[PDB]
Write a protein that binds this ligand. Sequence first.
Ligand code: SAH
Ligand code: FPP
Ligand code: MG
Length: 296
Amino acid sequence: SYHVIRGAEVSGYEGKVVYTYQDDPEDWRKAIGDRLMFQFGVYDDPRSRPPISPDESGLRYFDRQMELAGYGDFGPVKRILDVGCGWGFGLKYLADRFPACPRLDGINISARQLEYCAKYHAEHRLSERINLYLCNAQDVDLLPHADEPYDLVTVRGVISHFPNDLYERSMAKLASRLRPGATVIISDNLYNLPLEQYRSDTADDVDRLACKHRKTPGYFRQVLEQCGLNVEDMRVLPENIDVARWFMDVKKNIETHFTPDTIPPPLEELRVMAVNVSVALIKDQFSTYSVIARHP
Ligand SMILES: Nc1ncnc2c1ncn2[C@@H]1O[C@H](CSCC[C@H](N)C(=O)O)[C@@H](O)[C@H]1O
Ligand SMILES: CC(C)=CCC/C(C)=C/CC/C(C)=C/COP(=O)(O)OP(=O)(O)O
Ligand SMILES: [Mg+2]
């Protein structure tokens, strides 16, 4: 079960995102791993015993981001928000990491992901601690209990799906729900060239995985600052060769567990996207960034 939140002004891009994440979570598990973590991974953790799966590299990327955010006396954490909560591992990970945090909220516009989130959280006995909302990032102001501000927010691989307009409005409303000194942990995928210069290695005529709203490091950071957040740390993470590795391991998973008949269309987009983006990553035209931001 999830609660519904509508802001009477619906984003026209929702349909494209819903389509992307519609399909059987068991097919996604075969592509990206059992944890269903969908924002890359690091292959440099001394704890990782090769071969390193997308489950291991994803987990260790999150650990590294938690370290950079200073959660290795981290201050009060009584309420957590996961923006675009995917298939719910992010909320489970934070729940286990913050056992004295009684409230974690997840927002998502994919009903199929939220259906899987509830069943998955229930199996791990977190249903009371974790609340799920069918809620666009731009209606975060409508989330219940504005009298209880968020201490920690994750936005990992979500801003890639935002039009510039949506991104600016969402971050302004997110900022308004933060306690002073609250941390925002961001992962996203940004183009290191001017947008006019960049040319897709493999022509994208179908908008692969609803990621057409490309952004630069400069603009990305400008928006966080304009909403009154302080950028504490911004860096390439994972490294280009690690994002490429994740992509190509996921491509291999898809080509090894599916045929062109049975493959769900979004996993076909991901299979093609893997070579295109990996080439762009090798050429340093594209990087995944870790951003730690705080409310002053
Ligand atoms: N405008 C929007 N508002 C809320 N959620 C959105 C959104 N656009 C995309 N999303 C969600 O953002 C997620 C992108 S994939 C990332 C999932 C998760 N952060 C992980 O690390 O695995 C999906 O759950 C998608 O449905
Ligand atoms: C969606 C998301 C951010 C979640 C995390 C996992 C993931 C697969 C990231 C996608 C990164 C991205 C912007 C791909 C663009 O490829 P493309 O083939 O669309 O590139 P192009 O069309 O710009 O050449
Ligand atoms: Mg694209």
